[PDB]
Amino acid sequence: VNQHLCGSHLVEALYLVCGERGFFYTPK
Amino acid sequence: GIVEQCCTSICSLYQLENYCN
Numbered sequence: 533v534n535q536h537l538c539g540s541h542l543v544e545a546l547y548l549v550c551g552e553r554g555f556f557y558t559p560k
Numbered sequence: 561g562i563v564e565q566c567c568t569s570i571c572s573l574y575q576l577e578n579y580c581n
């Protein structure tokens with residue numbers, strides 16, 4: 533499945549879940 | 561890491577919390 537299109541959804545998911553704690557997103 | 565697990569299969573909020581800071 534496309535990982536870049538999927539990656540676009542995960543960063544929004546992580547934004548909601550992590551809230552104030554933030555996160556690091558490394559595509560590789 | 562999050563790529564393979566949350567893209568091929570649907571990850572819950574519980575699984576996604578593991579990638580937070």
Ligand SMILES: COC(=O)c1ccc(O)cc1
Pocket residue numbers: 541542544545565566567569570571572
């Ligand atoms: C907004 O929720 C998502 O887009 C999502 C994408 C992949 C997942 O594994 C989980 C949630």
Ligand SMILES: [Cl-]
Pocket residue numbers: 537538
């Ligand atoms: Cl898509």
Ligand SMILES: [Zn+2]
Pocket residue numbers: 537538541
């Ligand atoms: Zn999409």
